[PDB]
Amino acid sequence: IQKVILHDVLKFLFVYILFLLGFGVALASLIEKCSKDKKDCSSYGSFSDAVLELFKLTIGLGDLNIQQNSTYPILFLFLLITYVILTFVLLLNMLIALMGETVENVSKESERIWR
Amino acid sequence: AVLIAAGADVNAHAKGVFFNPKYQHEGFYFGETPLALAACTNQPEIVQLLMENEQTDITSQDSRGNNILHALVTVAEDFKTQNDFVKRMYDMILLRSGNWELETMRNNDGLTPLQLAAKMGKAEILKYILSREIKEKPLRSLSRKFTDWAYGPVSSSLYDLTNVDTTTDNSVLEIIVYNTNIDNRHEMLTLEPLHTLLHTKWKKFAKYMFFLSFCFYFFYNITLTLVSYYRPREDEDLPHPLALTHKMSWLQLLGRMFVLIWATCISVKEGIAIFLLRPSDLQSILSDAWFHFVFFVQAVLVILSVFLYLFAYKEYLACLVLAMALGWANMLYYTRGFQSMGMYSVMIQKVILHDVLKFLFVYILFLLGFGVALASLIEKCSKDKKDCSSYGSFSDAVLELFKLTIGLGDLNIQQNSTYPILFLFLLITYVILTFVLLLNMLIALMGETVENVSKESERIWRLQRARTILEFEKMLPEWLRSRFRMGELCKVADEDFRLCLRINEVKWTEWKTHVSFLNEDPGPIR
């Protein structure tokens, strides 16, 4: 647990927060003013709301709704599918492949480090 | 020996089409002379027989401009195929000549034998030439490695930097880094006068220019984000906050000017670096100039978002938002200053090209295949008049199968389907093919890619940092390159100064008494 955190988990969290806060401002700058429906017209209305909705989409909770208050509805869906490919397909599946290389090397030495 | 004593011409040139072949299987190129034929076919007794003859001109050139030492570089191969006889023929011919006449001769392309080995990727000959040390006294001047002092285990050597450093054109360091053809650039930079020479450039000037490059690109994105997120938002009024149109007399308006003048500094500069490097190959695009296009595509979308405001098409906002999201993903270029994150960005490049693109080709075949089958199976929604099905169209069925794979939403089998058992058979078959087969096999194939690239990802990183070091060096002026110059003048022999580079070494295995040193007193003198 000590070797996996220092080698693998900290490099993952550095690249993930670059993509979380990067697509979070792009999607928040693309939503209109909510005066026409006066409440609950969008869940991406702020920077703090768009970062929360992209974090729920990675751990698997909630529900996906593309009927936002966006001016450009095709551009919103292009940036929201690109976020899924970079994190759900690339970064989370590569963390498992890099932990299997760390475990293979520390298994030779973990008994002498314990004593 | 019968024919030479009978008067055979020892300077004939076999210049036919079979001896100057067009393709590699049609003929055999050896150097057109009978001295090169004996050397390229591993016949050392006939080489010694021909060099003793006084009529043998050892400095003759063929039609390509090559001489005897250019031709041995052309036919050289690895240790696996051609074990090592070419490296021993290069040494025997050079010592009998006794001059620098063959080493400093240029063929019709303008290359010496040292620059021809770096052009073709001959890493076993180039290891020999850069570290050539001759121990005998009258032939010591033909070396490129000199022992300055030695005392027991410790020694100190000097490596010649005549045509390997970037003080001239077509240097050895510039040919190895910028070579699109060969496929062992990252193994040729581990050689010893080249490995220390890039490490010296990174300490003196190159790490400080890589930090000013980071700071002014970070401030460029953080002032592009704030002016686009904090726009004046009205339905009746949409002022572009850039160029400072309203006379509000609000200072710190230079941040609005810093996006205009810095978008033109990038689009002009990255247009030149694409123009000077024509790859003519899609593999050379992805492997060397990926960050030249993607810094150029961003800086154009910032400029087009200002020309579309002057024409008022109201699609400028589509170009700013694409420039904001692309700009924060371009901060991953700057992870090559560090070894830990720089080797991690080499894994991301190899996993996308090998594993992720094959997954997306088979997944979209199954997504769009079951999407039309399930959409053609749902009735007309006039009986309930609204919300009777979520699979009513092709565009709705593709969306509901994408949500079912990433894990969101809710599964409902009470559709408006005519055949309710056939709908559930096609919806469970989609889960087995993607959730059980394709997503679990992507993890198993990434573990095979990671296992092979882990052997090579450090040498691939140092080739990516070496291209960053050299492009900083063509930028800074002539009077800065004299101050940050490597090496020191060393009196090698009588009237011979070569501007060498010093490397220290400790060795405990081969014990010997020391001769052929340049200096008797071992300690550092000043």
Add this chain to the structure above:
Amino acid sequence: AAKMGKAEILKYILSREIKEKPLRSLSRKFTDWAYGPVSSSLYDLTNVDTTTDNSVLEIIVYNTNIDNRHEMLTLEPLHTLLHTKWKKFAKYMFFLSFCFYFFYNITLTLVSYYR
């Protein structure tokens, strides 16, 4: 030998080169020319090519019994002979087979979705 899967005897027969003069006619591999490293050889194709019935190439491909078919096709007069067929006619017949099966599905989909 091709029927039973004897890959060590079949490697010997297909590349049999005899150097002596009166018994050179019993070869199946002849040196056309040579100059230094480069040479050029000739491989006999009497009963290994598909101009006759029960050829060696047809027995190795269509054999259900043996379990080393994919190792016996690496042998040398058989490896170049399949590469020559793919360049001359077989890659062009594999592309017309793709185009008329793609158009068959794309006209079956449109008439069933737009009923």
Add this chain to the structure above:
Amino acid sequence: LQRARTILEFEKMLPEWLRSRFRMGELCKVADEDFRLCLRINEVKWTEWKTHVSFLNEDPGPIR
């Protein structure tokens, strides 16, 4: 092996006058009255050095 089964099933389909045009090989005079329709493969070898006998042709270059 999966591509080789696709190549051969295309060859039984196309007619007899197409198989003469796409036929592999060339007639080679091996000995006195012996023609065998061989196939040519080139090779470069750097390890075993020897003098050359038992060749069919003295002049090494491609003749036409």
